[PDB]
Amino acid sequence: RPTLPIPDLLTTDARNRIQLTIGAGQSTFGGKTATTWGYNGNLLGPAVKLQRGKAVTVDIYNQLTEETTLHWHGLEVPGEVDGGPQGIIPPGGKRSVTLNVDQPAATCWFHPHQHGKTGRQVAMGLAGLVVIEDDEILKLMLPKQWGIDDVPVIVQDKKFSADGQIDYQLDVMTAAVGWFGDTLLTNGAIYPQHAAPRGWLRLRLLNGCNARSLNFATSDNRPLYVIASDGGLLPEPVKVSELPVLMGERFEVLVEVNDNKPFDLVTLPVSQMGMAIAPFDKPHPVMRIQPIAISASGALPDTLSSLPALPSLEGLTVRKLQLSMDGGANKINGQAFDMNKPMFAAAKGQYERWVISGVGDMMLHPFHIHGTQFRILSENGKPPAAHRAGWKDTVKVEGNVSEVLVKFNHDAPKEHAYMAHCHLLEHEDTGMMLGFTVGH
Ligand SMILES: [Cu+2]
Ligand SMILES: [Cu+2]
Ligand SMILES: [Cu+2]
Fold first, then answer.
1. How many C-beta atoms lie closer than 10 Å to residue 274's C-beta?
2. What is the CA(340)–ligand 2 centre distance, in A?
3. How far apart are CA 401 and CA 380, in angstroms?
4. Which ligand is nearest to the CA of 87?
5. Does 313 share its domain with 411?
6. Cα of 73 to ligand 1 centre, how many Å?
7. I want to staple 71 with a disulfide (CB 3.0 to 4.6 A). Which of 63, 113, 116, 229 is the partner?
8. Is 73 one of the annotated binding-site residues?
9. Computed over its alpha carbons, how large is the radius of gyration of the chain?
10. Ligand 2 centre and the CA of 439: distance in Å?
């Protein structure tokens, strides 16, 4: 019933600056008000729009009463501006960062990375988007009318207490299984409707849940055409009937909109501890798409981009990352995250093979590496699915072993280290994270 909220597409001003204010306010869910946090607003955040090769400065004002950090998930930027747990912005503080984007068009995102409290700060409402454009993507005639036929879809669950407030506590169960709830939000709204031009509709999907994996489909089983993953366009669209999306992952899809029939985007029950409990025991509506008769702008191209050949593996450095959960201690290579002790020093500008194992438990670990867009060689036992075979910043690890081919183009010293971690936020917050350096 409510219309789908559309994050503002925020570009630079004449001074080449973008302002983000982090703050607390109020939102309403099912007629009950709650304290929430947002960037440039009460909840969630804008879509920061960047152009490849054009530097911008982002002025970040922390108007929370606790410290936070601002991490650009998916961006290939130096450790200095990565906004991992060392990137502290004190209460009432200001921090400016220069972003010099040098990667292909993609939908990335941004969120807090406060040490030990990333889950709570995301749960409270902090997340925004990053839209990177380049000259290539603009030649494709994709749907491009922001908030009309090019729509961000940030999907998140929340657990609310009886008083209507967000209920987040990092207790033993929450630390093991993750924070999840029985209420689904779509750009902050409960089961919103979106009026979409007849023709093609582009959805920029973000699984912004702390712990819940998702599996997108349409209520009448019309296909979704995947055109992009975390790190940008696929070579060609990949038609799917369902689309699993792990925590922190993005996919852009095209879906057909026919004059007549409204339909829902839905999420299908998943096989994951906690997540099949009602109301997620059956297909669960995410949003209603309402066909309208206004001008469309784009269509589905036969070809999207050119992906590089995977290079020969001979002579590449191999790094092994063993994930574990010992009682209440979550760790990598037998170590809970130590912010003053990067685990290893990666080379800058050199392909490496990273092998990440979840052998020893059956929990779901979407493993995310900062500072890169990588290629998955093996995902949890098999070469990746076609729509997952392009540029990724996350790889599934669940009771098996994954292998990714990674290259870091920017420096990250000990004082501003890159993170590699499980993006089940409660696992990260209780130790399933390492720091690593790149270059000097
Ligand atoms: Cu990240
Ligand atoms: Cu420095
Ligand atoms: Cu995990």
1. 17
2. 15
3. 5
4. 2
5. yes
6. 3
7. 113
8. yes
9. 20
10. 13
- Residue 249 and residue 226: Cα distance in Å, rounded? 13
**CA proximity to 440, closest of 316, 372, 342, 332:** 342
Three-point CA angle 350, 354, 360, nearest 5°: 170
**CATH number of the domain to which 15 belongs:** 2.60.40.420
Distances from the Cα of 222 to the Cαs of 148, 244, 286, 389, in angstroms? Answer: 20, 16, 15, 23
Name the residue type at position 53: G
Q: Which of 102, 133, 164 is the last residue of a domain?
A: 133
The helix/strand count (H/E) of the chain reads as: 4, 30
**Which structure tokens are listed for 202?**
């582009």
C-alpha torsion 246→329→88→132, nearest 10 = -10
In terms of domains, do 73 and 94 share one? yes
- Residues 399 and 397: their CA atoms lie apart, in Å, by 7
Evaluate whether 219 touches 200 at the Cβ level (below 8 Å).
no
Give the ligand at the shortest distance from the Cα of 366: 3
**Nearest-angstrom CA–CA distance, 350 and 317:** 9
| 187 plus 81 within the same structural domain | no
Give SS3 for 79.
Answer: helix
284 and 364 co-located in one domain? no
Strand residues in 268-349 grouped as ranges (E): 284-292, 317-326, 329-332, 344-346
Quick one: 42 and 68 in the same domain? yes
Is 194 annotated in a binding site? The answer is no
Residues 333 and 367 in one domain: yes
115 marked as binding residue: no
Beta carbons within 10 angstroms of residue 263's beta carbon:
19
Q: Two tokens at 35?
A: 């304290």
Taking the centre of ligand 3 as the mean of its atom positions, its distance from the CA of residue 396, in whole angstroms, is: 10
Nearest ligand, measured from the Cα of 422: 3
Query: Are residue 93 and residue 196 in the same domain, yes or no?
Result: no
Residue range of the domain that includes 16 = 1-133
Residue 369 Cα to ligand 3 middle (Å): 13
Overall residue count recorded for the chain in this entry:
440
**What single-letter amino acid sits at 96?**
S
Give how many domains the chain has, as a whole number: 3
Q: What are 327's two structure tokens?
A: 């009682």
410 CA to centre of own chain? 21
Domain final residue, candidates 133, 151, 185: 133
